[PDB]
């Protein structure tokens, strides 16, 4: 619940800044906005690509840390770690 709330807020903010910066960079706009142009399942797939390296994921570090901490706790609960 909370993780997706934060992700949605961050994606809205990044879309707003891309819309602000398209006038400076119209050429960059296409593959900047491809993420918003992608279907929602593929959007969440791109946003969930920071498990190992893969910095192309637009997700910020302050949300990556939340997901990694919860994943560590889940692995500990499952006894895998």
């Amino acid at each position: 619940d909370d993780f997706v709330a934060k992700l949605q807020d961050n994606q809205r903010f990044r879309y707003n800044e891309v819309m602000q910066a398209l006038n400076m960079s119209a050429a960059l706009t296409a593959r900047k906005t491809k993420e918003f142009r992608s279907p929602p399942q593929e959007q969440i797939n791109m946003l969930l690509n920071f498990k190992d390296d893969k910095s192309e994921c637009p997700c910020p570090e302050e949300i990556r840390d939340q997901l990694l901490d919860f994943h560590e706790d889940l692995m500990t609960h499952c006894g895998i770690e």
Partner: peptide, 19 residues
Amino acid sequence: VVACFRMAPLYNLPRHRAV
């Protein structure tokens, strides 16, 4: 490509669908 541009991003979906 106007429809492809305006197609709803993840932040427009209801919270439960995105969850």
